[PDB]
Design an enzyme around this catalytic site. Structure first.
Site, PDB file in Angstrom:
ATOM      1  N   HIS A  78       0.864  -1.263  -0.029  1.00 21.82           N
ATOM      2  CA  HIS A  78      -0.101   0.102  -0.120  1.00 21.82           C
ATOM      3  C   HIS A  78       0.648   1.424  -0.002  1.00 21.82           C
ATOM      4  O   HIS A  78       0.753   2.062   0.884  1.00 21.82           O
ATOM      5  CB  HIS A  78      -1.098  -0.066   1.117  1.00 21.82           C
ATOM      6  CG  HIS A  78      -2.267  -0.920   0.971  1.00 21.82           C
ATOM      7  ND1 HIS A  78      -2.282  -2.162   1.682  1.00 21.82           N
ATOM      8  CD2 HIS A  78      -3.250  -0.721  -0.150  1.00 21.82           C
ATOM      9  CE1 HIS A  78      -3.434  -2.670   1.209  1.00 21.82           C
ATOM     10  NE2 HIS A  78      -3.900  -1.856   0.327  1.00 21.82           N
ATOM     11  N   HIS A  82       1.462   1.620  -5.837  1.00 22.92           N
ATOM     12  CA  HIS A  82      -0.029   0.926  -5.799  1.00 22.92           C
ATOM     13  C   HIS A  82      -1.032   2.102  -6.367  1.00 22.92           C
ATOM     14  O   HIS A  82      -1.644   1.802  -7.228  1.00 22.92           O
ATOM     15  CB  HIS A  82      -0.329   0.485  -4.372  1.00 22.92           C
ATOM     16  CG  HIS A  82      -1.995   0.147  -4.408  1.00 22.92           C
ATOM     17  ND1 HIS A  82      -2.614  -0.659  -5.103  1.00 22.92           N
ATOM     18  CD2 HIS A  82      -2.655   0.664  -3.336  1.00 22.92           C
ATOM     19  CE1 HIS A  82      -3.855  -0.706  -4.992  1.00 22.92           C
ATOM     20  NE2 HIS A  82      -4.215  -0.009  -3.772  1.00 22.92           N
ATOM     21  N   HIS A 118      -6.680   7.235  -2.901  1.00 24.67           N
ATOM     22  CA  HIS A 118      -7.527   6.336  -2.362  1.00 24.67           C
ATOM     23  C   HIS A 118      -6.858   5.558  -1.187  1.00 24.67           C
ATOM     24  O   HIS A 118      -7.677   4.991  -0.477  1.00 24.67           O
ATOM     25  CB  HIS A 118      -8.221   5.441  -3.361  1.00 24.67           C
ATOM     26  CG  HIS A 118      -7.408   3.879  -3.509  1.00 24.67           C
ATOM     27  ND1 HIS A 118      -6.400   4.109  -4.421  1.00 24.67           N
ATOM     28  CD2 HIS A 118      -7.458   2.757  -3.087  1.00 24.67           C
ATOM     29  CE1 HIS A 118      -5.891   2.790  -4.461  1.00 24.67           C
ATOM     30  NE2 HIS A 118      -6.435   1.985  -3.605  1.00 24.67           N
ATOM     31  N   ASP A 119      -5.557   5.413  -1.222  1.00 24.77           N
ATOM     32  CA  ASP A 119      -4.876   4.787  -0.251  1.00 24.77           C
ATOM     33  C   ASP A 119      -3.964   5.565   0.747  1.00 24.77           C
ATOM     34  O   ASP A 119      -2.884   5.035   1.348  1.00 24.77           O
ATOM     35  CB  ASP A 119      -4.256   3.432  -0.545  1.00 24.77           C
ATOM     36  CG  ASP A 119      -5.244   2.369  -0.623  1.00 24.77           C
ATOM     37  OD1 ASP A 119      -6.066   2.206   0.376  1.00 24.77           O
ATOM     38  OD2 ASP A 119      -4.950   1.359  -1.572  1.00 24.77           O
ATOM     39  N   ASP A 230      -8.456  -0.864  -8.185  1.00 26.33           N
ATOM     40  CA  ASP A 230      -7.826  -1.102  -7.051  1.00 26.33           C
ATOM     41  C   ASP A 230      -7.212  -2.699  -7.048  1.00 26.33           C
ATOM     42  O   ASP A 230      -6.180  -2.890  -6.705  1.00 26.33           O
ATOM     43  CB  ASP A 230      -8.974  -1.329  -5.848  1.00 26.33           C
ATOM     44  CG  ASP A 230      -8.247  -0.600  -4.578  1.00 26.33           C
ATOM     45  OD1 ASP A 230      -6.812  -0.715  -4.008  1.00 26.33           O
ATOM     46  OD2 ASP A 230      -9.013  -0.424  -3.757  1.00 26.33           O
TER      47      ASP A 230
END
Ligand code: Q2T
Ligand code: MG
Ligand code: ZN
Length: 339
Positions: A78, A82, A118-119, A230
């Site tokens: 993560h 990514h 998003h992460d 994702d």
């Protein structure tokens, strides 16, 4: 300082210059050097016409891209790479599936920006661990659920609210509210629990057929596309799937080690003494990954090849499973590892 200067003054390089197959589903964005990824983000936004269409200020956009990259830590999976690869797959969907027939322009832009963010600030541990370790994030968000995802969203908003980084600064009050709401919906959709809760509604939508005048269908499609991005490492070749398993289980086993030290019993998949990778990956592919890309294929005929490549990678795992059992003696001609 120097990175920003070149990103702003050297010019936004053409997207084809990154790689000849950059716009193809066969391309693996993890092969791009990390030092080249920020420019690739700009090149993609330019090629999707978003810079021109929303009159994004170039100095602001450059600062934004770098700050987003700086907001990822370096756990095995993560991390920024990514986020880049997820954002790249969003671009691939734009280039290959004709998203402009299903979604508004602003929704596609929001999806891309959401992929980037998003992460944000991931610590290599999942939602359960936050609650179990009584982290600050669980203190903030445990009662709402989706602890990490709410944190990712809040980090993204904090970047926007940093001076010189609000790429939506000139938007109308309505379009600004729209963008932030989309980002919320899309980032929260990256929680597996959310995907599971809407999975029947996704199947229903694919059965009755996509109605682009139905606002709920737009929302549902956005969630499906986000999850598709994702998990897009599974749509490449075997080697990518093998490398990502290595990264995923390194991260999981670190959490499992942390949990054992707190006196808790980790999940099998996070326990390095118990986890059997081939079986776990097969299960993840059959129950989580493959149905997502099957729904994608049901909605977009041109997505067929994505589901096919995931199904093939699933079979590669079954084919290589025997390699996890030691036949004969190990290389050192010893059985010392038994003692
Ligand atoms: C539906 C989209 C999910 C996006 O969020 C995540 C979060 N964590 C992990 C993943 C993920 N990405 N790749 C994988 C692979 C290759 N194997 C994976 C195997 C299991 C799980 C399921 N989770 C259960 C709870 O603990 C974390 C893993 C996620 C996995 N995963 C996705
Ligand atoms: Mg996530
Ligand atoms: Zn992710």
């Amino acid at each position: 300082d120097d990175e920003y200067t070149k990103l702003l003054h050297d010019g936004i390089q053409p997207v084809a210059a990154i790689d000849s197959n950059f716009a193809s589903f066969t391309y693996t964005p993890r092969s791009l050097p990390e030092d080249d990824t920020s420019m690739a983000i700009l090149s993609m936004l330019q090629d999707m016409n978003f810079i021109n269409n929303y009159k994004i200020d170039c100095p602001t956009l450059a600062r934004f891209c770098l700050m987003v990259k700086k907001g990822y830590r370096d756990p095995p999976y993560h991390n920024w790479m990514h986020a880049f690869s997820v954002s790249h797959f969003c671009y691939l969907l734009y280039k290959n599936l004709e998203l402009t027939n299903y979604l508004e322009d602003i929704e596609i832009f929001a999806l891309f920006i959401s992929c980037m963010c998003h992460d944000l600030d991931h610590r290599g541990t999942n939602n359960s661990f936050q609650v179990a370790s009584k982290s600050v994030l669980a203190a903030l968000y445990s009662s709402e659920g989706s602890v990490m995802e709410r944190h990712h969203f809040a980090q993204a908003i904090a970047i926007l609210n940093t001076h010189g980084c609000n790429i939506f600064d000139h938007f109308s009050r309505k379009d600004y509210q729209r963008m932030l709401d989309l980002m919320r919906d899309i980032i929260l959709a990256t929680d597996l629990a959310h995907h599971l809760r809407i999975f029947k509604d996704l199947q229903k939508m694919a059965e009755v057929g996509y109605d682009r005048n139905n606002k709920q269908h737009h929302r549902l499609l956005l969630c499906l596309l986000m999850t598709s991005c994702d998990l897009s490492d599974q749509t490449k070749g075997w080697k990518t799937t093998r490398k990502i398993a290595e990264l995923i289980y390194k991260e999981f086993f670190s959490q499992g080690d942390l949990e054992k030290a707190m006196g808790n019993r980790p999940m099998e998949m996070m326990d390095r003494e118990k986890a059997y990778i081939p079986e776990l990956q097969i299960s993840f592919m059959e129950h989580i990954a493959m149905p997502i890309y099957k729904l994608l294929q049901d909605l977009f005929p041109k997505a067929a090849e994505l589901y096919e490549r995931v199904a093939s990678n699933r079979e590669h795992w079954t084919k290589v499973s025997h390699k996890f059992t030691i036949r004969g003696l190990p290389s050192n001609n010893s059985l010392d590892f038994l003692d």
